Design a protein around this ligand. Sequence first.
Ligand SMILES: Nc1nc2c(ncn2[C@@H]2O[C@H](COP(=O)(O)OP(=O)(O)OP(=O)(O)O)[C@@H](O)[C@H]2O)c(=O)[nH]1
Ligand SMILES: Nc1nc2c(ncn2[C@@H]2O[C@H](COP(=O)(O)OP(=O)(O)O)[C@@H](O)[C@H]2O)c(=O)[nH]1
Lengths: 24, 36, 431, 52, 430
Amino acid sequence: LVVAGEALESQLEALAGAPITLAE
Amino acid sequence: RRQYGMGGSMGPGAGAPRTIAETMRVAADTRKLGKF
Amino acid sequence: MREIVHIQGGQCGNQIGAKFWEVVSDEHGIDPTGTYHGDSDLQLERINVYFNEATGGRYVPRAILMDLEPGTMDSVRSGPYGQIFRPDNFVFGQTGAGNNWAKGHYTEGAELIDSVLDVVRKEAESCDCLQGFQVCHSLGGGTGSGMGTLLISKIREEYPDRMMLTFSVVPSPKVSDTVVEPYNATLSVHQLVENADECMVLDNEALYDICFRTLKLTTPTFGDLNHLISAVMSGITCCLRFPGQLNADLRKLAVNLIPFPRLHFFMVGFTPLTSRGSQQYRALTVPELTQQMWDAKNMMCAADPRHGRYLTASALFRGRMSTKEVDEQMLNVQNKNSSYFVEWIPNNVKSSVCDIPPKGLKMSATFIGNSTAIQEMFKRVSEQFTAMFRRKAFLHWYTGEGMDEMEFTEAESNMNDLVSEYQQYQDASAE
Amino acid sequence: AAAAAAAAAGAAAVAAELPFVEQVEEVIAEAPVRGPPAPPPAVAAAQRASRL
Amino acid sequence: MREVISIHIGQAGIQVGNACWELYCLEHGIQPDGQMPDDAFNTFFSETGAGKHVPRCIFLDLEPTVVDEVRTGTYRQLFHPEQLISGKEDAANNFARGHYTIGKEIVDLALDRIRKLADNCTGLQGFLVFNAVGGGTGSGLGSLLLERLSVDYGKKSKLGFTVYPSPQVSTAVVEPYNSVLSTHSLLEHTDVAVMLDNEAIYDICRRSLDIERPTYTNLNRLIAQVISSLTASLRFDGALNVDITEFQTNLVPYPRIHFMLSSYAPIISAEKAYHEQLSVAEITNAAFEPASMMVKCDPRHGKYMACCLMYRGDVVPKDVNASVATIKTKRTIQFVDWCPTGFKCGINYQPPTVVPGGDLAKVQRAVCMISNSTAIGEIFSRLDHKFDLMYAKRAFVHWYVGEGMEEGEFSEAREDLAALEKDFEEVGAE
Ligand SMILES: Nc1nc2c(ncn2[C@@H]2O[C@H](COP(=O)(O)OP(=O)(O)OP(=O)(O)O)[C@@H](O)[C@H]2O)c(=O)[nH]1
Ligand SMILES: Nc1nc2c(ncn2[C@@H]2O[C@H](COP(=O)(O)OP(=O)(O)O)[C@@H](O)[C@H]2O)c(=O)[nH]1
């Protein structure tokens, strides 16, 4: 029965971390 | 990717940072939750 | 024609209210059977403030007595002045709250609170104009504190603009009567800060000290302490019931006393309290009343004013006196004890004068002090509550009545906030 | 126009100094009427002297 | 023909009105029942079919106790039952309460009765508003009523006998607050505002009357004597007749500067009576003494702008002229350079009547000196920091905000009082 909050800052961290290289 | 990293830096970059009755009435909820 | 609805909660509240109604009936010349026998016109002029006209010449208190156990109000009804109350105003359950604030506020008081508010509404709607409600009860008790806080919340919801006055017997510092006094006090202070407009703080041990030192009784039973509390409770509203040279209603006292909304707790005292030995030796004069008024021992609150600073102080005098005498005495008090008076308020005295002193005293005076001294009392409650709350002692009862743990932490957080408010205004400097 | 461009550059520099200073866009049904924020007492005295 | 409408707002207003109307009844011979056993009462009283005289007064209050005291007292058959207007809830020393929320219906009824009273007057010299600056009823309701009267009646001269807080001694805590608010309100609505201070009247009673225990009844008796001496020229003939309308023309150099000190002389008990000459020169000197002033303000600090003297009793134009010449030649009393005359002397042949049971003695001469002087800005300087000291912490500001006020209103009132301070300095300057 918990309601919990997911911080969007994790998604910003995921966006800031990208492999790129030859793949992108 | 650089722009997104700049935004990610800004996020926590902003996250990191009258009468006295008002001064403590504005922060009473924060005090209660933190003390719990 | 500005009516006051009296409410009594718990055993302590019921006993104090019974003594209070005996005192008020004596002041208004009402015998225990309800007939007026005062032979005195100003007594009947404003009798509607507290009483209602019955079919005969009888008068009924506008009082609502609440409990979860029948014994306390069985004793109250069988007491000397038990027959004045309307039996419909006795709202009580069958199983008492075992000194459990959770039981008195959530489980058992909640079913009874519907009837309580029904009686409250019935009594209030009959009033022409309503000054407000006064609730007498004790912090540190289950049914009293719990149902009192619940009723105060409900009445605050119903009548936001009407005055709310509370007389709470705070648990004494040095000797504790019930074990869970710090929990009950912490939970009830949280409600009183938010809801009650004006609150009076009383201490049994301070009353014992005053009645053994100034009054010098040998075995003061609870009746004597209740008589002191009733004297203060009558004197606080005598300006409504009697003509005054400089009259002051409850709202005037609230405006002149409360600088900031949450700092509405006061320490009170009554003068002149004389031992029977020195009644002849004392001189009953305005300077003497003021000197006894501003004594730390005369304070009915455990906290002594010397440690703190008086934010404000109202003094309701009663009797044929010189307003120049009164005003000069209070100005002299402020100039002499300027260290004990807050600097950023140019005048710290709200002086009221009523032309009708209580029976037996040519002059009298009730004192209501808003000082930062109550900080240390809230601090002591903090020190006890935290001590038990670290080990969750006696907490499982409040848990099992359907109360979150976080309600306790919120209550104590608010009470610590009030503590720090008092400190900050005590040490606040002008400019 | 050159002066205006210099002013805009200075505003950009101030924005760089203080990242994302809040500006209230509008108010929607502020239930109690709220007046302008009170100035510091020295500024209030200066404004009083200006009015006098 | 020379009717003046009296208004009494708040406890202090009603209690000084008790003394004032007792004094007028004693002066005109009107018994407390209403009737007396030519036409000198018309200024204050209108006679009805039975011959009963009813005063042209209105007792307004939001608290029922003070008015019911009159309804029960000896003056129950004199005043009109609807003239006594009672509220339900007191203003509780809240200007917002007395001006914004509770006072509305009461002031509407007040204007209704005031219109009824004014329709009973052929002429109307003006209004005498008696209130207490320093309380919600006195400040808020009085300010509202003054505003309404200025709006509708128009040219009627409104004289406000305001009782202001004493410098050091006081009985209220929000008294600087509502005093500043009411001062801002009446700076533009009253025509002549008279300052009174309880501390100064207490000092007068302590020294001149030798009363070690003065009280409100004593204070109101002195105030009533002052007001009766003020109005004596309207009701009784005498050399150099003085008028309500010409109080302004002889007294108010500029409309802002219309706050006035009052001083009575002699203030002597019966035992000290008939022991000194009490000549015109001596009583004028006493009236210009700092102790005789009914406001705690040293006149030596500022400079007098105008001084209106009302003499009652055996006073001759030579005596008043010689006394005023001596006062002008006196070095301590300092007048402004721009008002070479600065004096309005007016005599009345009716000596001041003495209220039985009072302490004032039967003196064949009396002086009421009402002075417009720039020294009065000094008490305003007192209230101006008593205000701002609390206003820095916004103490008791929530009480006023709750009944429909704003921080801007306090700021505007305090700024207006600062502008009044600047005005006093400029007018004192050359
Ligand atoms: N000189 C003099 N002053 C008085 C007398 N009675 C009251 N005052 C002053 O009047 C002030 C308050 O008057 P009011 O505002 O009318 O009191 P109230 O009738 O209860 O009305 P509120 O207080 O506004 O709710 C006090 O500060 C007193 O100093 C009096 O008899 N003589
Ligand atoms: N002054 C006074 N205090 C009392 C009396 N009876 C109880 N108390 C105090 O009230 C406190 C709380 O008791 P109470 O709230 O009435 O218990 P409850 O009825 O079960 O809620 C106790 O610490 C007692 O010291 C009395 O008759 N007079």
